[PDB]
Design a protein around this ligand. Structure first.
Ligand SMILES: Nc1ncnc2c1ncn2[C@@H]1O[C@H](COP(=O)(O)OP(=O)(O)OP(=O)(O)O)[C@@H](O)[C@H]1O
Ligand SMILES: Nc1ncnc2c1ncn2[C@@H]1O[C@H](COP(=O)(O)OP(=O)(O)O)[C@@H](O)[C@H]1O
Ligand SMILES: Nc1ncnc2c1ncn2[C@@H]1O[C@H](COP(=O)(O)OP(=O)(O)O)[C@@H](O)[C@H]1O
Lengths: 890, 254, 71, 686
């Protein structure tokens, strides 16, 4: 029968019949080992314990009562079969640990005691209890005792278990806190003491059914019911519960039986290889909060390997025939699931371990040439870098392909990696490539959490009128579900860019799982359409619950996927194509890029300078994207200085000769002020000295004066800043008066950088010790600009995004949808800057996220935010942000 | 006391609309904390020796504050109970046929409550509605009636849950939905998932009057050996028990 | 309390303090003060600015504290 | 070392010189109780006071034979307070004298009992002898609280002795009782008894306001068996086939043996399992049901027909093995059950325990009725060595040494300090080695699993060393006052003054509670071996790492070292990882040549056994040093292991809480594996 089943699982079967087959292989394998042990033990008597200790089934159709036709006996227990339809469910491999669990729990059931499996999580205590309950046909309930535990429900749930004859399993019962643990223990003790009297020596025949008190009234207790307390126990239940140590399951046996039920020949070798490999991955690989090398992950890898093998054989058929290498099929399944979650350091380690446990075999990746060609078209027009392997951009495109695979498999993908990796670019390029290849439109809803209150994210009920108002994500789900507007032919990717946090994913945990439904406070349920993908673009998983991380697949975007060469290529491609002025500007931009191309290459001036600056000391934590973006903005200004120079001089425009010598020196100036503009003067001098010995750009002749003290002017010459500091004589009534600045070395150069970075409308933060002159340096440049009106705003610990909202309402007006709702200042032609006093002052949350900082980041990066009144996207028109702060060490 | 004598002169009830197009009171925090502060202040001033400018100005208003507090802390309970029971009696169907005396008593109660709400809306002044006689006694009668009818609804839910004990696995709102949508059987299929282990749907007749079997999440069907007709067993608990029994019997025969 | 005093000291105005009826009453009394102090009435924003400046020149906040430097 | 530390004391300047002579010193050291007579080794001429000699002998006993520390302290208390001081504790306490006179009716008598013991019988006999009625009440029922309150109200006015059973279940009601007991009681005869187990959640206010009596189960197999036989009803043991009496006797013997082995928890069963009356009740129920099923009638059934397999399997897998966590405690449970529960247990020459007290044995009582088994149990000798339990005789010495160290620690915790903390921190800084270097990483050695493991180990050790150095130098700087401490520094000082290991310094597995000085010492040893490893890696890339005679105890994750060695052997050949099995060779000379697949380790200690060349043999002296234990990985042939080999667990600490790996050893030609299993033989890294 086993041979027939194993020959019938290789071919094409319906999924239901496939599951029936696999259940049959599991039982027939268990029966095969049991019979083989009986044969080897020379068992002849049918009353021997070696046979009497096995779960045995006795079926007698002659009985008129439905419930007692089938009798199941384990050792001396005699349960009837609750003829309740279980569905299809999932079947456990009867390992010796599972057999011991069955024996112990059945013995506890006969003694009218309870079963209390204990051990590390993931062993199979809850699943073994459920499997035993399903073997006897009982309606088994599992109560999750870690969180989302409804105490008010337990009162009637226990009564239901009593009056139905249903079981009950408490997954991780010790996770309950003492207040609710004590009362649940009291109810469980009442139930157990009521159930213990069913086996009274003198009252075994209970003419009057035995009752307990749960709802302040007597309720009958059926003998068929049971309660199981799985742990990781209260003195009430110590005398009424049998305990079993479920410490370590037989992973090799489970793997072998599952592989054999998947149709794998030589499943024993594959299991005894894959289990040690999963053991090593918990030792040799760096510990990550998202790594799952447990039993559930192993089972998932095994079923995926079975699917891969069936796909391979059915592909070969359309070109029995059982000559495929099983190990290579197992390795592909491991690598198609574990590599996306691996950090860049663990990727070579995984293949080293693979070559250790599976020597000689190699992992070959699906080419997906169809999508890799549309990637080259979505890129090269978004000014990004494409790769095809070891070449530049290969890691990023591999991460995009893995992201595509996870979107195909899962629906709650979670792109995670250090800030500065190409996560957002990856999913944007994937969305565009999918829209091009499949012809299905893709619309992205980038909802930023931690910027609005959770009530505004979902909604709430007013306790007086009981009227329901929907939140942002809830309204998005409504507009996707209720209104069609090409529903099935639009890819709604609801990207949750921001920081992951338990509080706003409590409601999402019901959506990330297979339920795919959102439960609202008012009781309505909305089901997620299959086109919707809930994407979590987050920086780290430090404050993510195990439920949320384990409920969805992910791809890890390490910092190594996006190299510096790729960023330089993006900068130069955007420079040569996108006009800074929204025709001669493009020409001068291309000339600038050509002049400055040899420095923006592999190694070279910029790479060496950035590497050297990373080992210096800065007031804030050094981020590569921060320095690179500041450098790019300064260089963009260097191409506008040429525009103004040409405009001022219609005749005799600056030719390539002057432009070359100007931009070579401006590149060094911008490198110095961008890679060391947040460090001490000694660090600036050190960076200048390092630059002097590695550059070919002509530098200031005087060696005793740092390069940081010079300016490039417009003629391509180092003009010292001291030549640009005037000697002013302030009138007597304005001596040391507010908003009175005497020019000096620092105020003439910092003002230059402020002009440079405000002409781009780029947000900036002025960092320095208190009273150093950050505010005065800013207002000496802001109010100089005719149209750059300033809005005073002070940030304290209790500051929340509502402060920015009230500032916007007071100084800005919402346009009546020219093209969507746009937030613009009341006056036209004037730019508002919201000076951020102590931008780093706001209080750190318990989950490491300042709400106002994330709120302003949402509109610095995505150019807007979401209104809380009608849940519509509002776009900033002429709003600019400027910050100032003391050093973070204070 | 100077501000106390004028805060009551200008004080709106701040009426709001309802899903049934009726007026209700939304303001409760300002209507409790401010009155408590005023009564504490007047009690302190009367107790305090420095009162020889207000020899008699708060005793005539201490009783007014007590009347405000009693009327409105009964009113909040009245309105909360009324809106909850209005939702229960209107959202779910067959509430007229099931519990007819309760439904008619609640209809009369809602008529009285809406008449009172119209009376308070025509003069949205708290002084102008405290002067109306019989408001306190009518409100306590209304609250006590609401308590009794809510208790009766709970008792009916308990007696319907006692039969077919699988109802103990669902909440009060879910069980009200189950027992109210007797005609619209198609809404029950979302609750069978929690009431059973594996059963998720019931295979009904062409006109959804005879239960031919059950189904599951995957789609596996279990045709009943003897289908049960809801027509001959109109009550939901009866045919649900019959469905469970026939499921057991069908599983045994198969 | 300290959050409110932060704005009362650094800038001299508390934005999230006078809202609704309080804001209108404050405008009434401050414009009346401007009239009785020989000050020309201006727009609501300019009148608010004048009131804030009046607070600047007519308000002194004193903090007394334990010499415990840890506090 | 103890001699050296005692010689540091001024009273023992001449201690090596004086122990050179007096050849009787060795005989005294080997004496069973070398505290009755102690050699004069302190250098004192004039002092002859009894207290001075007593304390000098106490220090000598702490130096020589610290297992007799409890006895020496008892003699010291005898000298300082007379030889009758503790004798009041030996006699059985009489509650009548305490309760009648110096127990006020306001004060509630707390009937404190160790879990697994009941103390209601004492006061029941008290009431029987004093003919006073008791309104005994069980605690745990909702109506039980009201009934107890009504009994309190109706008994204070009449002075009726109220009793509450297991009142520790409810802490809130006990708080209410303690609060309400402040009210005066009209009657003086009132005496309130709260029977309650030693539970840390019990209110402290009740403990302060009440008289606490502590009762413990008397140690010994004989007392345990008397307790079990008294618990079991006479009717339940006498009926049915007469073999049930001997089955109950065997069950009582097994239960007593496994509970008295719990006292020797390190060397007995690795951790303290809970084996109270519930397990014995379940085993009795199992025996009842299976003898009813097998022997339907009342006939004298043959022992061969006894369902031995059913009882052994149910008591090894379901009711006694259901609490065993690891493999080896389960193996020893199985060993006991196979040894006892067999048809040979009904013979007349069947030994309950062999090798006991040298060469004697404990015979089975040839009995048919419970009376003869009980009389046999009460005829057991008062003397009981740990050899009754299958454990070696020196388990008593180990337990006594542990108890002496515990008493020393308790007195130490029952004892400005800027200067002492400063000097100890400076001594730690001087002794702890300097920074650790990891400046070797070549492309060719990234493939080596040994290099990867050693690199991760050295990196983690260097980071933790830098953290410890920085924190301890910060502590030093705060000591002089030139730096101000913070909350982390405050809790660090609070931990260091009490000598408890800081939680921030714990990143590798350490014994559950140890002195910070020991942590600093073993940390210094670990850093020293890591420096040696780094120096070897600097000298050579992949040649010296294999030839490192590493100390397995000092590794932060020695199991990772075993895995890395397996990986290295797998890469050396074309073999895969799962195709390898560990072979272990213990040598004598340190300069023994190492093979290509062989890996030498040092510091391994063998417990309760010794090896001549590579064959184990039992030894009464525990902790036999294994010099240069070689680990070999070989192509396993998938053959069954012989019956002349044993699988010993390899633990890292003296406490047996974490398994590193398992080692197979060939035993000598005389010993059997079962004796190794029951003697607690294992290999220890530290
Ligand atoms: N080939 C490339 N692919 C992707 N991004 C590139 C590439 N070349 C340069 N870049 C730049 O690198 C950055 C990619 O970061 P991206 O915006 O995708 O990150 P994010 O997930 O939104 O945010 P963060 O990295 O801070 O978490 C952009 O500034 C982009 O212009
Ligand atoms: N004997 C077994 N055969 C097959 N799968 C098992 C077995 N034991 C455990 N598992 C799997 O392990 C996974 C986790 O087990 P679980 O019941 O969550 O353990 P715990 O409750 O101890 O955390 C389950 O998905 C289950 O399928
Ligand atoms: N040229 C100058 N450079 C530096 N500081 C100056 C200069 N001119 C005036 N100052 C004084 O420096 C102080 C800096 O004040 P402020 O800008 O509030 O400091 P911060 O912005 O660091 O909080 C001002 O009070 C101003 O009087």
């Amino acid at each position: 029968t086993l041979n027939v089943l194993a020959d019938s699982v290789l071919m094409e079967q319906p999924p239901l019949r496939r599951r029936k087959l696999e259940h049959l292989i599991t039982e027939l394998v268990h029966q095969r080992d049991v019979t083989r042990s009986l044969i080897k033990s020379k068992i002849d008597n049918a009353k021997s314990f070696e046979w009497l200790s096995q779960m045995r089934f006795y079926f007698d159709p002659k009985q008129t009562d439905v419930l007692q036709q089938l009798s199941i006996q384990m050792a001396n227990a005699k349960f009837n079969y609750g003829f309740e339809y279980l569905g299809v469910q999932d079947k456990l491999v009867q390992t010796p640990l599972t057999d011991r669990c069955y024996l112990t729990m059945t013995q506890a059931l006969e003694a009218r005691l309870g079963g209390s499996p204990f051990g590390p999580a993931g062993t199979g205590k809850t699943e073994s209890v459920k499997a035993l309950g399903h073997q006897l046909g009982r309606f088994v309930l599992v109560f999750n005792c870690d969180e989302t535990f409804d105490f008010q429900a337990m009162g009637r749930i226990f009564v239901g278990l009593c009056q139905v004859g249903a079981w009950g399993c408490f997954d991780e019962f010790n996770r309950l806190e003492e207040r609710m643990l004590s009362a649940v223990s009291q109810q469980v003790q009442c139930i157990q003491e009521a159930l213990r009297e069913h086996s009274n020596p003198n009252y075994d025949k209970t003419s009057a059914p035995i009752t307990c008190e749960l709802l302040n009234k007597q309720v009958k207790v059926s003998p068929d019911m049971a309660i199981f307390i799985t742990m990781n126990l209260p003195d009430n239940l110590k005398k009424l519960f049998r305990s079993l140590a479920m410490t370590k399951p037989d992973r090799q046996l489970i793997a072998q039986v599952m592989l054999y039920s998947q149709g794998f020949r030589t499943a024993e070798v594959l299991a005894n290889k894959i289990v040690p490999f999963f053991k090593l991955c918990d030792e040799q690989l760096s510990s990550q909060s998202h790594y799952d090398f447990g039993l559930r992950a192993l089972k998932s890898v095994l079923v995926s390997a079975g699917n891969v093998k069936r796909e391979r054989i059915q592909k070969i058929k359309r070109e029995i025939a059982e000559n495929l290498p099983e190990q290579e099929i197992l390795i592909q399944s491991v690598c198609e699931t574990m590599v996306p979650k691996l950090v860049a350091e663990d990727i070579p380690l995984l293949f080293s371990l693979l070559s250790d446990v599976f020597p000689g075999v190699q992992y070959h990746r699906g080419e997906m040439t169809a999508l890799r060609e549309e990637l080259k078209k979505v890129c090269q027009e978004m000014y990004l870098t494409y790769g095809d392997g070891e070449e530049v951009g290969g890691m990023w495109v591999e991460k995009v392909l893995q992201l595509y695979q996870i979107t195909q498999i899962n629906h709650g993908l979670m792109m995670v990696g250090p800030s500065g990796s190409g996560k957002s670019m990856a999913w944007r390029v994937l969305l565009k490539a999918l829209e091009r290849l499949e012809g299905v439109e893709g619309v992205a809803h980038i909802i930023d959490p931690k910027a609005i209150s959770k009530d505004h994210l979902y909604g709430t009920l007013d306790p007086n009128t009981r009227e329901w108002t929907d939140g942002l994500f809830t309204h998005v789900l409504r507009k996707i579900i209720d209104s069609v507007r090409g529903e099935l032919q639009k890819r709604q990717w609801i990207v949750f860019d921001g920081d992951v946090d338990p509080e706003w994913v409590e409601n999402l945990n019901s959506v990330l799982d297979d339920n795919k439904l959102l439960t609202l406070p008012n009781g309505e349920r909305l089901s997620l359409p299959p086109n919707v993908r809930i994407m979590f673009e987050v920086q780290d998983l430090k404050y993510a619950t195990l439920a949320t991380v384990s409920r969805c697949g992910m791809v890890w975007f390490s910092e190594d996927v996006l190299s510096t060469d790729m960023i330089f290529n993006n900068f130069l491609a955007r420079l040569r194509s996108i006009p800074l002025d929204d025709s001669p500007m493009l020409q001068i931009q291309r000339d600038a890029a050509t002049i400055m191309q040899p420095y923006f290459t592999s190694n070279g001036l910029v790479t060496k300078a950035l590497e050297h600056a990373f080992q210096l000391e800065h007031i804030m934590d050094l981020t590569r994207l921060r320095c690179l973006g500041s450098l790019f903005s300064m260089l963009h200004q260097a191409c506008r200085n040429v525009a103004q120079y040409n405009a001022n001089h219609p005749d005799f425009p600056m030719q390539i000769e002057q432009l070359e010598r100007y931009i070579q020196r401006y590149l060094v100036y911008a490198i110095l002020w961008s890679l060391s503009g947040d460090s001490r003067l000694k660090m600036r001098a050190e960076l200048g000295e390092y630059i002097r010995r590695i550059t070919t750009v002509p530098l200031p002749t005087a060696p005793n004066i740092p390069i940081i003290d010079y300016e490039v002017s417009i003629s391509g010459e180092w003009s010292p800043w001291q030549a640009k500091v005037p000697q002013i004589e302030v009138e007597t009534h304005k001596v040391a008066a507010p908003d009175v600045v005497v020019p000096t070395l620092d105020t003439v150069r910092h003002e230059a950088l402020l002009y440079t970075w405000l002409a781009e409308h780029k947000p900036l933060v002025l960092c320095g010790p208190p009273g150093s002159g950050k505010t005065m340096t800013l207002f000496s440049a802001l109010r100089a600009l005719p149209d750059m009106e300033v809005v005073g705003l002070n940030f304290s610990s209790a500051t929340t995004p509502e402060l920015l909202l009230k500032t916007f309402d007071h100084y800005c007006e919402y346009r009546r949808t020219p093209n969507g709702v746009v937030l613009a200042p009341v006056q036209l032609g004037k730019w508002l800057v919201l000076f951020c006093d102590e931008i780093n002052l706001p209080d750190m949350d318990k989950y490491g996220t300042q709400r106002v900082i994330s709120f302003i980041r949402q509109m610095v990066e995505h150019g807007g935010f979401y209104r809380t009144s009608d849940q519509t996207w509002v776009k900033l028109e002429r709003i600019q942000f400027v910050g100032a702060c003391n050093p973070p060490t204070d | 006391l100077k501000q106390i004598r004028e805060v009551w002169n200008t004080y709106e009830l701040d009426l709001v609309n309802y899903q049934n197009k009726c007026r209700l009171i939304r303001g409760w925090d300002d209507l409790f904390n401010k009155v408590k502060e005023h009564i504490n202040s007047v009690s302190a001033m009367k107790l305090s020796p420095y009162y020889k400018v207000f020899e008699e100005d708060a005793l005539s208003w201490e009783d007014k504050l007590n009347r405000i507090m009693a009327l409105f802390d009964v009113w909040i309970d009245v309105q909360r109970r009324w809106v909850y029971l209005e939702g229960i009696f209107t959202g779910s169907a067959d509430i007229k046929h099931l519990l007819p005396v309760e439904t008619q008593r609640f209809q009369s109660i809602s008529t009285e409550f809406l008449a009172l709400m119209k009376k308070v809306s025509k003069s949205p002044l708290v002084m102008d509605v405290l002067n109306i006689q019989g408001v306190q006694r009518s409100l306590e009668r209304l609250a006590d009636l609401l308590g009794k009818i809510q208790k009766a609804l709970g008792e009916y839910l308990e007696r319907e849950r006692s039969s077919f004990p699988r109802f103990y696995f669902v909440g009060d709102e879910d069980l009200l939905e189950i027992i109210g949508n007797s005609k619209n059987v198609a809404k029950l299929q979302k609750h069978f998932k929690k009431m059973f282990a594996g059963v998720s749907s019931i295979i009904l007749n062409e006109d959804n009057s005879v239960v031919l079997g059950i189904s599951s999440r995957e789609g596996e069907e279990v045709m009943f050996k003897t289908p049960v007709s809801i027509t001959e067993h109109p009550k939901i608990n009866e045919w649900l028990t019959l469905v469970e029994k026939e499921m057991r019997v069908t599983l045994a025969k198969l | 309390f300290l959050e409110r005093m932060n704005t009362l000291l650094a800038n001299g105005e508390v934005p999230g303090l006078f809202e609704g009826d309080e804001y209108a009453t404050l405008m009434t009394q401050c414009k009346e003060g401007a009239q009785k102090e020989g000050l020309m009435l201006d727009s609501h924003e300019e009148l608010y600015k004048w009131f804030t400046s009046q607070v600047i020149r007519n308000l002194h906040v004193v903090f007394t504290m334990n010499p415990s430097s840890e506090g | 070392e103890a001699v050296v530390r005692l010689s540091c004391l001024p009273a023992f300047k001449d201690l090596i010189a004086k122990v050179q002579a007096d050849e009787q010193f060795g005989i005294w050291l080997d004496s069973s109780s070398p505290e009755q007579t102690v050699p004069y080794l302190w250098s004192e001429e004039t002092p002859a006071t009894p207290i001075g000699q007593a304390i000098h002998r106490l220090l000598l006993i702490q130096a020589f034979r610290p297992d007799r520390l409890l006895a020496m302290a008892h003699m010291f208390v005898s000298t300082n307070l007379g030889e009758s001081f503790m004798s009041i504790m030996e006699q059985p306490l009489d509650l009548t004298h305490i309760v009648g006179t110096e127990v006020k009716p306001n004060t509630p008598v707390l009937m404190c009992s160790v879990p697994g013991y009941d103390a209601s019988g004492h006061v029941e006999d008290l009431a029987a002898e004093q003919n006073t009625q008791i309104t005994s009440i069980a605690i745990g029922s909702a109506e039980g609280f009201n009934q107890a309150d009504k009994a309190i109200n109706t008994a204070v006015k009449s002075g009726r002795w109220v009793m509450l059973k297991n009142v520790h279940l409810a802490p809130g009601w006990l708080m209410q009782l303690e609060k309400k007991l402040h009210s005066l009681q009209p009657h003086a005869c009132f005496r309130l008894f709260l029977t309650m187990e030693i539970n840390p959640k019990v209110p402290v206010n009740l403990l302060r306001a009440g008289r606490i009596f502590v009762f413990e189960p008397p140690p010994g197999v004989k007392a345990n068996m008397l307790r079990t036989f008294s618990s079991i009803p006479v009717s339940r043991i006498c009926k049915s086939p007469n073999e049930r009496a001997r089955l109950y006797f065997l069950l009582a013997w097994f239960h007593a043996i496994i509970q008295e082995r719990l006292r020797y928890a390190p060397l007995g069963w690795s951790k303290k399992y809970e084996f109270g009356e519930s397990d014995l009740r379940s085993a009795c129920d199992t025996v009842d049901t299976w003898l009813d099923d097998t022997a339907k009638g009342r006939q004298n059934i043959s022992p061969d027909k006894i369902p031995w397999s059913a009882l052994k399997t149910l008591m090894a897998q379901s009711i006694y093995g259901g609490r065993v966590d690891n493999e080896f405690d389960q193996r020893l449970l199985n060993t006991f059950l196979e040894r006892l529960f067999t048809t040979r247990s009904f013979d007349s020459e069947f030994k309950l325990a062999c090798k006991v007290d040298g060469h004697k044995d404990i015979q089975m009582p040839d009995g048919i009725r419970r009376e003869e088994f009980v009389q046999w149990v009460e005829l057991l000798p008062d003397t009981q060595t740990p050899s009754w339990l299958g454990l070696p005789n020196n388990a008593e010495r180990v337990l006594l040494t542990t108890q002496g160290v515990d008493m020393i620690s308790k007195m130490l915790k029952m004892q400005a300090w800027m200067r002492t903390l400063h000097t100890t921190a400076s001594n730690w800084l001087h002794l702890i080695p300097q920074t650790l270097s990891h400046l070797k990483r070549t492309v060719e050695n990234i493939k080596d699993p040994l290099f990867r493991f050693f690199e991760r180990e050295v990196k983690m050790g260097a980071k933790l060393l830098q953290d410890v150095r920085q924190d301890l130098a910060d502590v030093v700087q705060v000591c002089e006052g030139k730096k101000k401490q913070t909350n982390y520094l405050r809790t660090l000082i609070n931990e260091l003054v009490k000598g408890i290991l800081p939680r921030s310094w714990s990143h590798y597995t350490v014994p559950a509670g140890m002195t910070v000085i020991q942590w600093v010492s073993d940390f210094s040893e670990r850093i020293k071996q890591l420096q040696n490893i780094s120096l070897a890696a600097a000298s050579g890339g992949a040649k010296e790492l294999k030839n490192i005679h590493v100390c397995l105890g000092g590794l932060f994750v020695p199991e990772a070292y075993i895995t890395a060695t397996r990986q290295y052997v797998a890469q050396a050949n074309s073999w895969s990882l799962e195709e390898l099995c560990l072979e272990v060779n213990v040598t004598t000379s340190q300069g023994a040549t190492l093979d290509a697949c062989s890996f030498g380790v040092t510091g391994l200690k063998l417990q309760g056994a010794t090896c001549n060349n590579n064959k184990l043999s039992l030894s009464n002296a525990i902790s036999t040093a294994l010099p240069l234990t070689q680990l070999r990985w070989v192509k396993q042939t998938n053959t069954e292991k012989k019956a002349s080999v044993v699988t010993l667990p390899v633990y890292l600490n003296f406490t047996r809480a974490d398994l590193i790996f398992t080692v197979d050893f060939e035993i000598a030609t005389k010993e059997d594996p079962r004796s190794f299993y029951e003697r607690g033989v294992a290999v220890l890294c530290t």
